[PDB]
Automatic annotation (TrEMBL), chain A:
Listed GO MF terms: xylan 1,4-beta-xylosidase activity
Gene3D superfamilies (alphabetical): Glycosidases, Glycosyl hydrolase domain, family 39
Keyword S-adenosyl-L-methionine: no
One of the GO BP terms on file: carbohydrate metabolic process
Similarity field: Belongs to the glycosyl hydrolase 39 family.
Keywords in alphabetical order: Glycosidase, Hydrolase
EC number: 3.2.1.37
Protein name: Beta-xylosidase
Lineage top rank: taxon: Bacteria
This protein's record includes keyword Hydrolase: yes
Alphabetical list of PROSITE patterns matching this protein: GLYCOSYL_HYDROL_F39
UniProtKB/TrEMBL annotation, chain B:
Active site positions: E159 (proton donor)
InterPro entries with a match to the protein in the record: GH, GH39_as, GH39_cat, Glyco_hydro_39, Glycosyl_Hydrolase_39
Taxonomic source organism: Dictyoglomus thermophilum (strain ATCC 35947 / DSM 3960 / H-6-12)
Protein name: Beta-xylosidase
Keywords: Glycosidase, Hydrolase
Length: 502, 500
């Protein structure tokens, strides 16, 4: 089935690089961890993410805000020891922070409500002039250490998911806007070329956008971009060890992108860049779907088309280095990361690297395949087949007619499915060891690769036809390119003369 | 002042000084900075063991609890500690396992210690704590094997004689905790050497109390542990802790009376492990950054090995959090190494002791001369100076017999002028959060002054004259030359432009 004839030198739209603009992370204090940095370098040797997005810049483990007690007065102290190391580490690797202002330092808090295992305080500041004092010092300290030309390339989003009460006392919307205003004017006081935005809402309360954008237009409050999150997980069941969840079809998320894009088109700021600062299928740090070939195939379409509606959409997260639900208890555990501990890539990691092959000129695209032309001649395509139900329809066949100007064609294929690059399975086979040995870790590394296959096709009537079939939860990548045979420059080349039947 | 000797020895310089080093909480071992530092140290000082608090702290998260139906069953999460002891072994160093503190879920009370809120109470249910220790030990053998883990010493708790580290300082209760813990470990593998009680100075009755308690009934003990500082009662400050200090002879004699106590105790050959030692005992005391502390502490490396099997400098680096997060590059943290792998003077003092052979030619309060198996000579001299109103310079004239005709001398000097990044940091403005180019300047100067000399040898001996400045340490290495110039035919430096 699925027949596709690509017409010689004809294009529909363009493939942008928005898909690699930013990733997500465990809280910024975890960037101190060797494992964190080892994983971040590994990712960055394979995907050129430009920005890194993480909670907890002002948590008390990074220890920025503290108080000194002179006489009877208390005085602010701004400790940059940890944040200097962390942001130094990023820039050395080549990734800037997408800065997320939050949460609230314990000694500025108004209440005792805290989210997560590491108890980030989510009450507003008990003194907004103290709050403004802290933001200002942080911002100019950044300018001093790193230079204005660089910090002006860092975006700042104000808080995280204020539409939820577990992320902002009473989900209070009047208060969030006051928090946003105090913060962004502090920032723009220090340098008004620094780009700010928000309101970083979860899905479900999209009216917050309209209220938020109206609030800014009304009261002359800067906003330079919009943010929101987007998961597809249906109500979960819990477990001391797991959170289990079903997910809407991937269409559901893409629909949200288009929806919020049109929401800002009817804003007073019809060109707000949109940054989807968090996206995944399931939204829990302990839900095993993140480990699965399914999740690669299910998210694949987001990379293929999400850039049509939003300027960025960052996958949460780049690594299982994470702590919102206590220290992971097993190598595979449901964590959000593209990479499990020991720099073991999950299916979804490889799916990301597949999109490195796409040129900008799109030859063809539908719900389950993208076909691009590179600037150099070449054609490259990615196809996916996510199968949600054990019922459903398990396989997907393609024949693709591809016109080529050359007589001799080289084809490379990379494939991941339940059989190839799925170390979760090999792990289950191992006995689901919670704390495996070096030798076990290394066999998992051996199998967490794509299957790579190469073909020579000497082509008929000026066109190649690719025939392949995707099994369940597979993603694949083909690169097609011109061969310049050099076998004639080998005088006396005869493979028949080599023992082995050749 | 004036020293001479001939072919004869006075003692043996053991490698005890390299035995173990202190560290921040093992939780901190996950930090890239920590591992970057431990690698840099271990590139220069072959330390064998590492001692740290916090093995059961909840940052590293070993002890957790799950609720099935109604009950609570334990859960032991090894993710972090596996990563940590993995990196230790990869670096080439093993842990002095210090059992502590108490996991919050197992704790009987509310009292904590440090910025990082380690619980200091006993277990609500000692049978549960027996479960915890044995499971952790078994996992260690499952992961690393018997032959390895049995090379790991186990120390129980830390400074129980103080209330801060063990509520009420209940010596009776601590004895109980020690008993349950020790034969748990031993039930898993009895060849695991265990010990205690890791108290600090000023309560040495605990020693033979503890020591006799273990002779009296059951309880096996394979070594003794104690800490050794010299800080006088301290002034406090929201940024600093300032302490004066007894002379170094204080703790060096504290070592000796502790050896005596065990020479007279039920275990006359009990090994002794000073698991912490420094001058001042606070993480925010600038003394640790100074040339003084290097010269003040040299003598512990010279003689302490004659009384104790080990004495671990608390700590190898400034990666520390007991007094919250350091607020300035130099802040008086304990570490041999400051952030960015910038060596403090004390570090260079440690690397000087690599040069010593085992055969001591001469030794006193302020020098140590040795011969190395290739029959070459080297010495370390120090000059600590506690006061402005003191003798400051300290002078040396040494005559050395040498069999050979041509000699080569290399000297490594550190004092207030050389190898002293603290001082350059003051010149720069005491920058709390230094730029990169400030860090690279600190590294350029945070190295000993190195100077070489060549001399012909007359009447089978040489003479070394040199003056230590205030708070100085220096190293001399004396070596045979085999001149090869005769084999350079046509050689003549005088034909080189440059007045040569």
């Amino acid at each position: 089935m699925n027949h596709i004839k690509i017409e010689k030198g004809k294009y529909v739209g363009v493939f942008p690089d928005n898909w690699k603009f930013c990733v997500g992370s465990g809280r910024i204090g975890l960037a101190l961890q060797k494992e964190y940095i080892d994983a971040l370098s590994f990712v960055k040797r394979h995907i050129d993410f430009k920005y890194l997005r993480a909670h907890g810049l002002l948590h008390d483990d990074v220890g920025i805000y503290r108080e000194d007690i002179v006489d009877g007065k208390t005085i602010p102290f701004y400790n940059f020891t940890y944040i200097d190391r962390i942001y130094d580490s990023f820039l050395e690797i080549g990734i800037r922070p997408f800065v997320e202002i939050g949460f609230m330092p314990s000694k500025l808090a108004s209440g005792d409500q805290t989210v997560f295992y590491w108890r980030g305080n989510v009450t507003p500041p008990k003194d907004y002039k103290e709050w403004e004092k802290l933001i200002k010092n942080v911002v100019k300290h950044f300018i001093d250490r790193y230079g204005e030309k660089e910090v002006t390339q860092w975006p700042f989003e104000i808080w995280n998911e204020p539409n939820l009460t577990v992320f902002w006392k009473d989900a209070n919307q009047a208060e969030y806007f006051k928090l946003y205003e105090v913060t962004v004017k502090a920032i723009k006081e220090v340098n008004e070329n620094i780009k700010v935005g928000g309101p970083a809402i979860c899905g479900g309360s999209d009216y917050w956008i309209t209220d938020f954008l109206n609030f800014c237009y009304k009261n002359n409050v800067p906003v330079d971009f919009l943010t929101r999150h987007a998961y597809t997980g249906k109500p979960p069941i819990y477990t001391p060890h797991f959170v289990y969840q079903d997910v809407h079809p991937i269409e559901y998320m893409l629909n949200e992108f288009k929806t919020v894009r049109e929401m800002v088109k009817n804003s007073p700021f019809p060109n707000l860049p949109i940054h989807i600062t968090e996206f995944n299928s399931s939204y829990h740090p302990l839900c095993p779907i993140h480990d699965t070939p399914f999740n690669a195939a299910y998210l694949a379409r987001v990379l293929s088309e999400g850039g049509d509606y939003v300027d960025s959409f960052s996958y949460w997260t780049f690594s299982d280095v994470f702590e919102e639900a206590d220290v992971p208890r097993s190598l595979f555990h449901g964590g959000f990361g593209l990479v499990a501990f020991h720099n073991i890539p999950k299916p979804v990691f490889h799916m990301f690297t597949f999109f490195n092959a796409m040129g900008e000129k799109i030859l063809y695209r539908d719900d389950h395949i993208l076909i691009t032309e590179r600037e150099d001649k070449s054609v490259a395509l990615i196809a996916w087949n996510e199968v949600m139900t054990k019922e459903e329809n398990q396989e997907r066949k393609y024949r693709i007619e591809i016109p080529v100007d050359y007589k001799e064609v080289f084809i490379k294929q990379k494939l991941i499915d339940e059989e190839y690059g799925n170390p979760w399975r090999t792990w289950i086979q191992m006995g689901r060891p919670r704390f495996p040995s070096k030798k076990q870790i290394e066999t998992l590394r051996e199998v967490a690769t794509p299957k790579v296959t190469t073909f020579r096709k000497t082509v008929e009537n000026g066109h190649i036809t690719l025939e392949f079939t995707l099994g369940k939860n597979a993603v694949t990548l083909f690169e097609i390119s011109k061969v310049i045979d050099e076998s004639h420059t080998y005088i006396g080349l005869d493979d028949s003369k080599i023992p082995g039947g050749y």
